[PDB]
């Protein structure tokens, strides 16, 4: 599998936040992670691209240990991330924001970088904004720039940590649409979300976290209409309908 996590334990000071997670994600997999805030979802996906370390267990991405100091560069080349907050460079255009890393990191000539960026911007519906600055864009558009930027590095894995959670309600659908499109293809995707209709339509597999644990996982239909675990049923009665 392209992501391999065995017996992951993680402490923030005295707080046992991740409690022996096992997770094996296939190449091409669309994995959706759900669960109450505080359950440990962000922390878990942050261990994948080495934004968080941990004291017990193993985390291996594309056959490389995340704790291998010699991998902490290849890991960032092949793993993209979209956060709920956009961190665009305010004094660079949309286009410049997208081409920066492929130019800095992959040492792509600007003409190559821009050609790919432009195709990506069209892909996510914002080619018209190519020469705008981030402050002229809505929340929906800015997050789509962040997605284009992540994809511009051409990673094998895209992590989405609740990309729509901080957006105005009318901004959510357009960002989710970009993620629906990407899910039609072969990219490995891990997305944390509270958008359950989306989760249900896109996921190969849904993982429910509570208390720093994977309490239940399975196919979307099973998890949403036949949850085998009580805490799962309890979580779904609190948030659905
Ligand atoms: N850098 C940190 N230091 C200390 N505690 C943290 C840190 N980051 C998160 N936490 C705590 O760890 C728990 C898990 O947080 P998080 O992974 O962000 O949960 P979720 O994303 O599921 O809402 C929360 O109780 C949070 O307060
Ligand atoms: Cl989301
Ligand atoms: Mg598929
Ligand atoms: Mg979170």
Domains of the chain: 1-241 (3.40.50.300)
**How many CB atoms sit inside 10 A of residue 145's CB?**
25
What are the C-alpha distances in Å from 135 to residues 144, 148, 226? Answer: 14, 17, 45
Q: Dig out the tokens for 201 from the structure.
A: 């339509």
CB-facing half-sphere around the CA of 225: CA atoms within 13 A: 6
Measure CA of the first residue to CA of the last residue in the chain; give whole Å: 35
CB-facing half-sphere around the CA of 46: CA atoms within 13 A: 14
Cα–Cα distance measured from residue 150 to residue 159, given in angstroms and rounded to the nearest whole number: 9
For helices 110-123 and 139-152, angle between their N-to-C axes, nearest 10 degrees: 130
Q: Are 168 and 132 in contact (CB under 8 A)?
A: no
Q: Find all residues with CB under 8 Å of 241, minimum gap 6, and list them.
A: none
Note every long-range contact of 21-24, with CB atoms under 8 Å and residues 24 or more positions apart, other chains counting: 21/57, 21/213, 21/214, 22/214, 23/207, 23/214
As annotated, the binding site includes 12, 38, 40-43, 161-162
Q: Find all residues with CB under 8 Å of 108, minimum gap 6, and list them.
A: 99, 102, 116
**How many CB atoms sit inside 10 A of residue 234's CB?**
12
| Residue with CA at minimum distance from ligand 1 atom 13 | 38
Ligand 1 contact, 50 CB (< 6 A): no
Model resolution, angstroms: 2.1
What are the C-alpha distances in Å from 67 to residues 60, 81, 155? Answer: 8, 19, 19
CB-facing half-sphere around the CA of 147: CA atoms within 13 A: 31
Q: Dig out the tokens for 51 from the structure.
A: 């934004």
Atom of ligand 1 lying closest to residue 43 CA: 17
HEC per residue, the chain: CCEEEEEEEEEECCEEEEEEEEEEECCCCEEEEECCCCCCHHHHHHHHCCCCCCCEEEEEECCEECCCCCCCCHHHHHEEEECCCCCCCCCCCHHHHHHHHHHHCCCCCHHHHHHHHHHHHHHCCCHHHCCCCHHHCCHHHHHHHHHHHHHHCCCCEEEEECCCCCCCHHHHHHHHHHHHHHHCCCCEEEEECCCHHHHHHHCCEEEEEECCEEEEEECHHHHHHCCCCHHHHHHHHHHCC
Cα–Cα distance measured from residue 47 to residue 78, given in angstroms and rounded to the nearest whole number: 14
Cα–Cα distance measured from residue 124 to residue 156, given in angstroms and rounded to the nearest whole number: 18
Bridge partners for 194 per DSSP: none
Tokens 């249900």 correspond to 200
Tokens 């922390």 correspond to 43
What are the C-alpha distances in Å from 163 to residues 66, 143, 157? Answer: 24, 7, 16
Ligand 1: which of 34, 38, 81, 161 to mutate, most ligand atoms within 8 Å of CB? 38
Cα–Cα distance measured from residue 88 to residue 92, given in angstroms and rounded to the nearest whole number: 8
Cα–Cα distance measured from residue 79 to residue 62, given in angstroms and rounded to the nearest whole number: 10
Q: Are 16 and 9 in contact (CB under 8 A)?
A: yes
Ligand 1 contact, 43 CB (< 6 A): yes
Experimental method: X-ray
Cα–Cα distance measured from residue 226 to residue 75, given in angstroms and rounded to the nearest whole number: 37
Spatial CA neighbour of 160 closest among 171, 174, 175 = 175
**How many CB atoms sit inside 10 A of residue 241's CB?**
6
**How many CB atoms sit inside 10 A of residue 68's CB?**
12
| Residue with CA at minimum distance from ligand 1 atom 12 | 17
């Amino acid at each position: 599998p392209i992501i391999r996590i065995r017996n992951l334990h993680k402490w923030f000071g005295p707080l046992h936040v991740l409690k022996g997670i096992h997770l094996e994600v296939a190449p091409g997999e669309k994995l959706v992670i759900i669960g109450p805030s505080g359950s440990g979802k962000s922390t878990l996906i942050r261990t994948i691209n080495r934004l968080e370390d941990f004291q017990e267990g193993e985390v291996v991405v594309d056959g490389l240990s995340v704790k291998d100091d010699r991998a902490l560069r290849e890991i960032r080349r092949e793993v993209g991330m979209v956060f709920q907050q956009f961190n665009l460079f305010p004094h660079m255009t949309v286009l410049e924001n997208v081409t920066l890393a492929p130019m800095r990191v992959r040492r792509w000539p600007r003409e190559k970088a821009e050609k790919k960026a432009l195709e990506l911007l069209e892909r996510v519906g914002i080619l018209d904004q190519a020469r705008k600055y981030p402050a002229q864009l809505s929340g929906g558009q800015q997050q789509r720039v962040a997605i284009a930027r992540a994809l511009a590095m051409e990673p094998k894995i895209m992590l989405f940590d609740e990309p729509t959670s901080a957006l105005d309600p009318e901004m959510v659908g357009e960002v989710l649409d970009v993620m629906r499109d990407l899910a039609q293809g072969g990219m490995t995707m891990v997305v944390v979300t509270h958008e359950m209709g989306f989760a249900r339509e896109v996921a190969d597999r849904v993982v429910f976290m509570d208390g720093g644990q994977i309490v239940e996982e399975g196919r979307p239909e099973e998890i949403f209409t036949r949850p085998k675990e009580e805490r799962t049923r309890s979580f779904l009665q609190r948030v659905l309908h």
